[PDB]
């Protein structure tokens, strides 16, 4: 399927919240895990270029993001995995993807490219697309943070 329109699947997150500090704590763990994972993906892109490890990293963040209902992040992760398995060889651009958002106003007053990184063989095509998706994931992560922050009345 394509990317979900909504940053948060409240049907999923509400289950976690019904168990409430717990959920906020869990969201903070997530946020740290994401930052690590992205930094690991980047390292792979600029260094070893192991598609198999990029697949693995995507697998890991997918599981976390999906469980918290951060379904757009989860979707990008799944694309990263497919790109890394060489099953896909396209990835949409940032404008196209943000144009599917259920509430596009969340983007007013932010540079959607703010967190972009770049890098520099069959594998080049895929590596480049994974780089592109990683940049997408960084934006999706920031948007998720913005929404979660507004819900918890605190900067996460």
């Amino acid at each position: 399927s394509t990317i979900p329109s909504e940053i948060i699947n409240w049907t999923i997150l509400n289950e976690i919240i019904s168990m409430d500090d717990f959920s906020k704590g869990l969201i903070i763990q997530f946020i740290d895990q994401a930052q690590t994972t992205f930094a690991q993906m980047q390292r792979q892109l600029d260094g070893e270029k192991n598609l198999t490890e990029l697949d693995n990293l995507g697998h890991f963040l997918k599981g976390s993001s999906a469980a918290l209902g951060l379904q757009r992040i989860a979707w990008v992760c799944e694309r990263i995995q497919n790109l890394g398995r060489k099953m896909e060889h396209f990835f949409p651009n940032k404008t196209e993807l943000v144009n599917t958002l259920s509430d596009k106003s969340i983007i007013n007053g932010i540079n959607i490219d703010e967190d972009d990184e770049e890098i520099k063989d069959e594998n080049s095509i895929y590596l480049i697309l994974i780089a592109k998706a990683l940049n997408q994931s960084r934006l999706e992560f920031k948007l998720a943070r913005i929404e979660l922050s507004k819900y918890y009345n605190t900067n996460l």
């Binding site: 289950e15 168990m19 869990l26 763990q29 997530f30 895990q33 697998h59 599981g63 976390s64 469980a67």
Partner: protein, 128 residues
């Protein structure tokens, strides 16, 4: 005196399930991040003449998946207690494959608390 092993390849997911178990009155919970680690923990508990009342086992994990882990645990260690699959694909097809590996129940992800409660009631010996 219920003791539960939670096997999930992501800490976040592990904490979600631990919290669920805690809210159901269960506090003795061990964690494993993969299939081998799980086997290792059962083997250890097993080295101490003790055992888990139930294991919740993530199906799709790297290195050693939940199917392999389950089979190693059952065959090498003689563990006969319930191993419940944590799965993203509750399609009847995969559900059979889990049973064939030695699992005896399933919870679909995202885990829903009422389903977790039912599993505990039905299969967890000594559960309040």
């Amino acid at each position: 005196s219920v003791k539960i092993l939670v096997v999930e390849d992501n800490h976040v997911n592990q904490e979600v399930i631990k919290r669920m178990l805690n809210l159901e009155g269960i506090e003795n919970i061990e964690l494993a991040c993969d299939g081998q680690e799980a086997f290792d923990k059962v083997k250890e508990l097993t080295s101490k003449g003790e055992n888990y009342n139930m294991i919740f086992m993530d199906v799709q994990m790297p290195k050693v998946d939940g199917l392999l882990s389950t089979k190693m645990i059952r065959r090498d260690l003689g563990y006969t207690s319930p191993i419940v699959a944590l799965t993203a694909f509750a399609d009847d097809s995969n559900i059979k494959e889990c049973l064939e590996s030695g699992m005896n129940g399933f919870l679909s992800k995202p885990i829903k608390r009422p389903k977790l409660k039912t599993i505990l009631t039905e299969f967890c010996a000594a559960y309040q």
